Amino acid sequence: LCFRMKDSALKVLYLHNNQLLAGGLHIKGEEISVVPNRWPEALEQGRGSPVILGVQGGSQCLSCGVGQEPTLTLEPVNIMELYLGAKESKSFTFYRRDMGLTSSFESAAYPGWFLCTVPEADQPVRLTQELGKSYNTDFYFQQC
């Protein structure tokens, strides 16, 4: 079972050039796998429910990388390997906070950094520490 996502400005999340973009208003959206980290106790759960985000049937997953500064990339690892503990998952883990209508996603590997979109159409989804400003950190789900 998968989800489709939009930012709170209703821009659809979809794939182009192996990047998640937000736009498609000029489109159902990429079917996103949202999978609970199966070892939750080892994480910071007051921040939200830890999940791994996948695309294309969970055959690629979103990572914040392992550098000093996070950056958002789709990596060719199946969510199964990340879920089964056959690959380290923390850079792939986000804390999902549910506000009712929308959810936000905070990097577990890089605290304070949130999944976000920019106002301009059809740009990459990225990460930000800045809340309440121009970057949109709130997302809608639609079930598939």
Domains parsed from the chain with CATH numbers: 1-144 (2.80.10.50)
Structure obtained using: X-ray
Which one, of 78, 72, 76, 83, lies nearest residue 35 by Cα? 83
- SS3 sequence of the chain: CCEEEEECCCCEEEEECCEEEEECCCCCCCCEEEEECCCHHHCCHHHCEEEEEEEHHHCEEEECCCCCCCCCEEECCCHHHHHHCCCCCHHHEEEEEECCCCEEEEECCCCCCEEEECCCCCEECEEECCCCCCCECCEEEEEC
- Paired strand residues for 62: 74
Q: Can you tell me the distance from the alpha carbon of 24 to that of 47, in angstroms, rounded to the nearest whole number?
A: 31
d(Cα 109, Cα 26) in Å, to the nearest integer? 35
For residues 141 and 4, give the distance between their C-alpha atoms in angstroms, rounded to a whole number: 6
Q: What is the resolution of this structure in A?
A: 1.7
Count Cβ atoms below 10 Å from residue 113 Cβ, excluding itself.
22
Between CA 62 and CA 64 the distance in angstroms is 7
CA separation for the pair 33, 67 (Å, rounded): 25
Beta bridge partners of 3: 32, 143
CB atoms within 10 A of CB 26: 6
Dist CA 27 CA 52 (whole Å): 23
> Cα Rg for the chain, rounded, in angstroms?
14
Task: Round to whole Å and give the CA distance between 113 and 94.
Answer: 10
CA distance 66 to 101: 32
Q: State the virtual CA torsion across 27, 71, 92, 1 in degrees, nearest 10.
A: 0
- Residue numbers preceding breaks in the chain (C to N > 2.5 A): 26
